[model samples]
Target: GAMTIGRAKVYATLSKIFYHLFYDEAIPKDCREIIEKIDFNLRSVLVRELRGSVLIKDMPQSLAEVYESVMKDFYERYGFQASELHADHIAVELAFMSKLVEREISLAQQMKEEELYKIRAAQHRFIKAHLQPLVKNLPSAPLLNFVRDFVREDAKYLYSSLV
Candidate 1:
């Protein structure tokens, strides 16, 4: 029960990041102001952090290979263009992890233990392979300083239980 609640909180955080990627009518009224305050140049900051970075090189061998495969599979499954696999975008990566966690929670609720194990394994793999790298490499961009801290804390909270 407690695990589920923690998972839900993580999901909510991921959704917030997803919504920040765009300024749309669908965003809740109360959140619009905070979203507006975000310095869009934070994307530039992300690009700098990812450029010629050895973070991928630092990933576990199997994880490095599986990470790309998972990202490609996720894009294909969702009908996202191959070009949309902007692996460098922190928000996109978090969204992918969020989707996996969302699926795990669903399988758990359905009592599909066998399938849940597979999803849980994938989540563990992703957290170690992809998320941990990104969290470590997070930059001190304008609004991103706060966002980075928030993401780091969220990642810790979400993945700590699994470890």
Candidate 2:
């Protein structure tokens, strides 16, 4: 039950769904299929949320600047590039988390403990700062509630799954 390859694959895939949902003009077909299968009615519910309701906004100026710097630091250092989409956007942040896990998976296989903990800590810290706030504050529906639960579980799971 360690943080095996399969677990990281699932983690990355879930984050990819959110990234595609918010960033793309249309959901990529494979991502759409998994989401649609999860809850048959979730797609339209998400479309409305995507249009205006779900992104994080109107935080204190200091917090906003912090988000900017955090994302910029990761994007540049991690070699993760994206469009001009606002850094605080849901898709962009999710993409960041996905990339972190993707890196962790590589580090785990390479038996790189120092950088593995660094990646793990990054995911935990970023979740508390960004994703959790968005999950808690954004407008909610059945699908969103499920998202909240899944994300919460994954956060806890990561801590436990690693040795």
Candidate 3:
């Protein structure tokens, strides 16, 4: 169960990236369709697309091509469907990240300001340590910006007063 949680965190982090791009209300329907073509099922494709540099909004057409290539390559590799893997992987990731966020929020309510800052700092470090190098190698400014903005927004939300 603990291991599953850990795996889920990884998946959630990945999903967070896509969630912003695909699920954000501001995102265009055409862009979301371009991303959907990627068939985010194969582990490698899921990993790459999530990490890839093609921004859905900017290069919608290119995204379609990359998505097709990713799907085709994945099918060739496994010689079987990857839809199940995509669902499983994404679920695990989302569950773990959600758990961590919930736990952190609960802890923050009981902690002093300094303690809260420290916790947020640790989270920033952990995310960067895990994602920086991987993110750097990927293409697309929008994708990178997405991660940066996501982390910034998350930190502010976690640390700042909603009131």
Candidate 4:
């Protein structure tokens, strides 16, 4: 039970990097080294794709409505507010992931094994039902690929840690 505190910390740190990319904030200097030097122009295009596009508007209207409600309900249940972004927005989904791992880490620190399990289980479910699916129809791009790999890897790690 206590062993997961180590894993929790790593997830927390990675999630922080993803979240700050949404806001006009510089990632911590220590974190900059791991994130790599980007092609400035490419990152600008990528950032535009993430923030400037209404990704889900490509969906059938009913499908879009249903998915948005589902994501919103789940996020609201945890008190995760997305401000004006659609619940399925890549940035909002990333923020929610950050929110969850923080809760997971908090529970672990308090030695609350039962509560930790619930949060971990929610993260696993959220990845499968919400986060992974949110990215499935998006066009291929370097940033999109990173999002895909990040969720896939993190969810896989969470699965083993949970099971």
Candidate 5:
């Protein structure tokens, strides 16, 4: 299947930005232990299982190999002993951000200072500036619902098969 891979690629690019924010010289060298001590598999089985599918033969080789190789690189480059990642590691943070973004946009309409503060903290500083336009006009409730639905749909089948 000639997949229209732009969205996934954009996601990877955005996630790379997030990764650098959290890991790029942000954690002190002495605190490298924290990275080592961090448990990678704190997420639900759904996300973890979906990640596991990167090894399947039926999937596109480019997609599978890219995922597998990047994960391997992440572990090696970080010198983390872990071999695999948990669903929670990826989904939880983003899900929380989704809710946060929703709140910010919703509150921004009323010109609430507090919500604007949070919105600025979560989006302006953390994510790409280009994302601001999309977020500024975003509908909070519907977007949150969509985020939840996306998680459910993306993870459901892969999770069930793992059991």
Candidate 6:
């Protein structure tokens, strides 16, 4: 008998990103108070982690090119940015990956191997060109120390799970 893992991991990772995004913006009072408990200082770290170093005005050229294409595709395919195309927005970056993975799952169910391969390739390309660089050169900050560890582990797991 064969058992199959599900898309729970993908959704879990997406949930983390959404949590960060929700907290990043102003929300209803009840929700705001609960999210605020996560500590405000970490916001800066989270921002930098998702976005890029404040020192740089733009993402690396390779990443920028990919982002441009991804953004355009997202707009055409979904009629929304999903998230901004900026390299610094880590949440948006993850969202893009999430979208692709979701599509990959559907294509798998439909037995569309060629399309599945393309989506998987895009996922790997994104991680290698964008995520890996950010994780490798992550800067040290107070609360960031804790977040950094979790992010690295999660990113690693996501990369491994993507197919």
TM for candidate 4 is 0.71
Arranged by lDDT, best first: 4, 2, 1, 6, 3, 5
Off by over 4 Å in 4: 1-32, 40-61
Candidates 5 and 6 compared by TM-score, better number: 6
State each candidate's clash count.
0, 0, 7, 0, 1, 4
Q: lDDT by residue for model 4 over 1-163, one digit each (tens)?
A: 5545544544455456545655546778765555453411234334434521246446567665577677788998988877566666666777787788778767877989998899889989988876776566466755566557767887788899887
lDDT of 6 by residue, 46-144 (tens): 564455443223666775556545545644564334543353455565565556667767787899978877776666666666554554555575433
Model 6, runs deviating above 4 Å:
1-41, 44-49, 53-80, 84-87, 140-163
Q: Residues 22-56, candidate 3, lDDT per residue (tens digit)?
A: 43324345544443423332334444354322323
Task: Order candidates by TM-score, high to low.
Answer: 4, 2, 1, 6, 3, 5
Better of 3 and 6 by TM-score: 6
Model 5 over residues 1-163: C-alpha lDDT tens digits? Answer: 1111322332333333333333432434432342342322222332333232232335457755565454445334423343223322332234333444455456756789865665445433322212222233223443223333443443342234233
Please estimate how well model 4 matches the true structure, expressed as its whole-model Cα lDDT: 0.66
User: Where is the poorest 10-residue window by lDDT in model 2?
Assistant: 45-54
lDDT, each prediction: 0.55, 0.63, 0.42, 0.66, 0.37, 0.52
lDDT-wise, the better of 2 and 3 is: 2
* Displacement of the residue 33 alpha carbon in candidate 2, Å: 3.5
Clashing pairs in 2: none
TM-score of each: 0.56, 0.69, 0.34, 0.71, 0.25, 0.53
- Which pairs clash inside model 5? 43-88
Off by over 4 Å in 3: 1-98, 112-118, 141-144, 152-163
Candidate 2 TM-score to native: 0.69
> Which candidate tops lDDT?
4
